[PDB]
């Protein structure tokens, strides 16, 4: 049969070879020996800081490459156009060491990224995205406009939009321009006296960092947090977002009373802002992007998680279940109720989301379009089926095959 | 070259060194990770007309005769020594070698300790080996199956068990169970190709019916064994209904539950896998436990392509099914969950649900790591269906490797 991994749906039965995958041009963390896939962070892509200027060769390859697949993204494959491109980049590298990007390419370059990320359950969105060119910038105080904009934009009153705002590449032995929090939008992590933590434990850190730069904290669950924004070679700055321009959506339960009484909520914007993107070899290390959310990551991860908000048991014993047996199931069933809550809440909030059903469904429906149009589509099997009801959504009965494709959104190291 | 892994929950990490002792490959390489397929495209157990190259198999076979001495502390003893020329001698001269019993239960349990898809593992140092190898006839099979079952059932209070039929032969047929498991639902393919009964069986229903099986009409309609001896076409056999314990499916507070004829067996028992032993195949070995609920509530009647129930469910909770939004699958697969629980509970019947099956499975892992340095897991399998996060082992990195003795997979017999 064909020479390519075969990839097989087993609730239809249907068989695709992936050829997509022979384009990696990345290794991954897997070898015949023994499989990494479900490792979240194993030392593959994890862009370290690599200050002194990088190979010439190396960036060279790499920016042909990208530049041969924009061309070919327009159909102008092998035309002077693109001959002549490739020249530039080359004359460009060969004199200053790097090259930039046009305009247009650019956007291109965010789109595919955000197309090859294995990890993102919601690409059949991946056409439609906003790219603010934000390659001008040159202070801490501008990268906090372009970000302040880039939320009005974006969370659109609810109708959310997906956008992401390209801030100057890393450049020759100089300091580069970092969003130190790892969302646009966190909430406290407020350590207690007895150990433990008020707010979001996944925030602990970037909490106590805000602090040691001169925030005054709350004490409060929910307590959104500063911007630590760095430009090059300066010590970051501080920023507060304006309250008017953080949309939250209290939460309450479509039939359960109560629950609204809790006092819970969640931000509407979800925009990562620590992940690198890199392009022809160019590297932007500070890239935020956003889109909308998928209910099971506030309901089930956020919420629910021990090192989280850890809020099952709490809500167990409300609608009074038994929590001294596993067998009463009633982990499952509070987790249920509160991932409807969530999305009960956003809906009333007319605020963008989705649950886990209907993103699956149209992730299915995105690898039909990607075979044909790509021959695969690269997909972490572990981050794409959802944490709860797994095998009650489609894309737990695909396999998938997982590999890395450039333009791409990478992890970095922490900036301090 | 070892794997750091961490568990995202606690924090703590560890390093698994295990996996530098697994000699046989894996689908992933560096280029593309293919960890989440289910079968593997080469890494099949191909046909035995031959004899296995007698320095492939030599070493195989040391290899596990030292494993065993070493477990039972008499390594480098004049009994160890002296196995290895016996081994080495009838190999020299057959081209193959026998187990010793006792060998032939160290390794069965060393096989499940190392099967990476399975995640009650905590119990691999408790089970019962029934030697089966003086087998030479289907009818002979019948009877050592029959027995399997009387055992491992136990009134409701079942026990893991496994029976090893006779090793693989160059040249001669293999002794083979057809169907999947002992017990499984016959699937009927009726009008507009839907299925009356189990969809995951049309095919082997098809089979014993052609063999002479008269079907039945119902949706759980419990099949007859197709044993095959060497060389032979299979032949058909009906399990005594006494020996075949099922539990009705009821809901502790759904009264209509019940009315949904609903029920499952006891006994899970697969019976198509192969067993390998310092090189040495057995192509009918099937082994038993117990189920853990999600099995049989969330993949066996709620999956799309099997009894599909949800929606039935659904509309009895009166449920919104006109959106996905109302969470109506979701809240039917609990309930469904629920009442296989409560039902193998009131049947006083073995069954570990999800939770506590994989809080276990992590102790086991700990257990691992100090004795030998890791575990091989299969992330996509240890996490159960449903409740994903909500159980200890999501936030677990695991490895994933193949260790020898060890289960695999085979081809079809026809
Ligand atoms: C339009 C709606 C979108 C939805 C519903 C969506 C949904 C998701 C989900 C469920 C995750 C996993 C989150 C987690 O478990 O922490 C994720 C990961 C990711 N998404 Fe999307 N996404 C969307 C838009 C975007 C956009 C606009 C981009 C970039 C331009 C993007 C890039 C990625 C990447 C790189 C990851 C991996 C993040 C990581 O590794 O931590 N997504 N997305
Ligand atoms: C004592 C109770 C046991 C429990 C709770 C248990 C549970 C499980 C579960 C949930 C799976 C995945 C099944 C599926 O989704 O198809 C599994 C797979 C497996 N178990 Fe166990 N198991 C137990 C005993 C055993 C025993 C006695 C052996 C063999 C000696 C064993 C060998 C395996 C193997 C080889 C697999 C993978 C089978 C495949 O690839 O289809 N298990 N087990
Ligand atoms: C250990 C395991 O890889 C880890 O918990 C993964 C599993 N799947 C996930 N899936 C998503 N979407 N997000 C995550 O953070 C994770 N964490
Ligand atoms: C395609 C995917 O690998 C497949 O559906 C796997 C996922 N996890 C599983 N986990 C268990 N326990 N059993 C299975 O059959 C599967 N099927
Ligand atoms: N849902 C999510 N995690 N994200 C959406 N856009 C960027 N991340
Ligand atoms: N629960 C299970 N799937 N099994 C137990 N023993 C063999 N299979
Ligand atoms: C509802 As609360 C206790
Ligand atoms: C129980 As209703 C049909
Ligand atoms: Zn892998």
């Given at each position: 049969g064909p020479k390519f991994p075969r990839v097989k749906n087993w609730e239809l039965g249907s068989i695709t070879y992936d050829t997509l995958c022979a384009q990696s041009q990345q290794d991954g963390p897997c070898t015949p020996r023994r499989c990494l896939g479900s490792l979240v962070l194993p030392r593959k892509l994890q862009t370290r800081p690599s200050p002194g200027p990088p190979p010439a060769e190396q960036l060279l390859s790499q920016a042909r490459d990208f530049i041969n697949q924009y061309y070919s993204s327009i159909k102008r494959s092998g035309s002077q156009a693109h001959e002549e491109r490739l020249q530039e980049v080359e004359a460009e590298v060969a004199s200053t060491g790097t090259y930039h990007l046009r305009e247009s390419e650019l956007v291109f370059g965010a789109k595919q990224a955000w197309r090859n990320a294995?990890?993102?359950?919601?690409?059949?969105?991946?056409?439609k995205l906003q790219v603010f060119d934000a390659r001008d910038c040159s202070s801490a105080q501008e990268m906090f406009t372009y970000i302040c904009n880039h939320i009005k934009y974006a969370t659109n009153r609810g109708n959310l939009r997906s956008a992401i705002t390209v801030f100057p590449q890393r450049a020759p032995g100089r300091g580069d321009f970092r969003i130190w929090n790892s969302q646009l939008v966190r909430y406290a992590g407020y350590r207690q006296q007895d150990g433990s933590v008020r707010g979001d434990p996944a925030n602990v850190e970037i909490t106590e960092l805000c602090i040691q730069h001169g925030w005054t904290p709350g004490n409060g669950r929910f307590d959104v947090l500063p911007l630590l924004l760095q430009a090059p070679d300066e010590a970051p700055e501080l920023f507060v977002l304006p309250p008017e321009l953080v949309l939250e959506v209290p939460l309450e339960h479509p039939t359960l009373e109560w629950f609204a009484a809790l006092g819970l909520r969640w931000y509407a914007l979800p925009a990562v802002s620590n992940m690198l993107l890199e392009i022809g070899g160019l590297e932007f290390s500070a890239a935020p992007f956003s889109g909308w959310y998928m209910s099971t990551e506030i309901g089930t991860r956020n919420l629910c998680d021990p090192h989280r908000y850890n809020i099952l048991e709490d809500v167990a014993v409300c609608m009074d279940?038994?929590?001294?047996?596993?067998?009463?199931?009633w982990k499952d069933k509070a987790a249920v109720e509160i991932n409807l809550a969530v999305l009960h809440s956003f809906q009333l909030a007319k605020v963008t989301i989705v649950d886990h059903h209907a993103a699956t469904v149209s992730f299915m429906k995105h690898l039909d379009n990607e075979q044909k149009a790509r021959g695969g589509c690269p997909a972490d099997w572990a981050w794409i089926v959802?944490?709860?009801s797994g095998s009650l959504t489609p894309v737990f009965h695909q396999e998938m095959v997982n590999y890395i494709l450039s333009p791409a959104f990478r992890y970095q190291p922490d900036p301090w």
């Open positions: 294995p990890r993102c359950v919601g690409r059949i969105q991946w056409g279940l038994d929590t001294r047996t596993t067998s009463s199931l959802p944490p709860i």
